[PDB]
């Protein structure tokens, strides 16, 4: 495992080296081919470095993390393009990777949380350093001070397992159940707020919208599954008590996940409806891991992973359109098809993913959820239909309504899509269906 | 009576006498067996069983 993390460590000089932009992604595209060789890896953990070991679990989420990380560099090109402190942004990314990588591959609870919030401070320069709305302040806090609110209780938690455990250590927890009612909500309301539940969701439309093209990538592509990998490990000895308080959040997340789908109807911003987007789906992920059961966990995993895919994807045609028409309302935004047709394309493939289309890794995903959402109580059908049927609403109104109409009057020339985007796409795409194939991989994590 | 006055400072001085009393006051010392020990400098000290012990062994 110490492989990856010498690798990024002696990639961080080439922030400084001048004309070295492209040639990092490269270094940063080849690491993912090495990770990508040493899968051997079982549900117990496997490779162990001082601390750092690693499972099929957060094998997935780690290389989830290098091919975003990766793809964030190719969508930020502009960063270049105008050399807007571009060394300094390749380090925030070189950075922001390291804290992920391990917080993945950390074997020990306090460390997860270690780098857990840590990722945050790289991320929260991002959004100040090239963002451009005003709002970027008003967005950096809400990403900032939600988190660090829910966190900060979080670690008197982790303290307390100490001096009845004896270890941090994900295995030598597993062997207990805890009784405390509050010990229940300090390490599951830290991540209840990150996923997002419904109603705590209040900064992930804020922290969207305005962060960068990058930042989008990762906010919505890695820090909404921090929080879903965190409740993987810490309700395995929470089986007790997630039972008594259980049905208040499979109710708030399945009745939050409806509701928020008709708030996408009435949505009018491109990236403010993929975000809310992003709360829609996170709420079957959450209900389904709080159902515990073998399927529920499994395909909440598999859905984390193809729903970051999407989301990030879905983040890279928003910029594109935005870049080009400068305004990021679907009022601006219509007709496209005739503007850039090669590019429509890619707007459907990741548009007809996040609705759940084959032969997506999302579909798989999202029928476990549901059976494991059925099985626990056959009254979830009602709104687990409804969420269903309005996860497709508000997509298709997304897609259609950006792409067929006639083209708008008072824009401007600009330029036509560019190798580079379709490029982009396709990485974003293409695996999310090939994976379908050796799903026993990133599935099989229990 | 053939005495004679003593000079001026002769009841100043130190006067040593024999005691016929014969009980000059004795001499101990008190004893507390149950006093907070301490780690004794002849005490082997090997190295520490896996160092620190404290998050990651740091
Ligand atoms: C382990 C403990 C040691 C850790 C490493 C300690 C040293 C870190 C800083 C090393 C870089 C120092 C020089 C530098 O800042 O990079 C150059 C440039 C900074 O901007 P500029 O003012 O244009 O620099 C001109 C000098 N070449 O580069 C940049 O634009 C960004 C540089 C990174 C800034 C990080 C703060």
Redo the contacts with the bound molecule.
Sequence with gaps: MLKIIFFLLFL?PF??INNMYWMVQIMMFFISFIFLLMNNFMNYWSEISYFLGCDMLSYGLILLSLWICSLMLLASEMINKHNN????F??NIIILLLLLILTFSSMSLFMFYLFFESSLIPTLFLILGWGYQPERLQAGLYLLFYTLLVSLPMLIGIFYLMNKIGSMNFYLMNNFMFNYDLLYFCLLCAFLVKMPMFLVHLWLPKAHVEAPVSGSMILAGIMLKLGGYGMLRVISFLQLMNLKYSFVWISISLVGGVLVSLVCLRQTDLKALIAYSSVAHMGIVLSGLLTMTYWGLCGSYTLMIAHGLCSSGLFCLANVSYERLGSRSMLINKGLLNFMPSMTLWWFLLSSANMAAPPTLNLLGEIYLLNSIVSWSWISMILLSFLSFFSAAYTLYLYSFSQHGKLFSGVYSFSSGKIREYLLMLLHWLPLNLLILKSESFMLWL | FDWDRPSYGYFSRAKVIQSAREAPKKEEKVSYPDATPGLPEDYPKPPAKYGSRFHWLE
């Excluded at chain 1, 402190?85 to 300094?88: S, T, V």
């Design positions: 961080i922030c400084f402190y571009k060394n300094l390749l380090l």
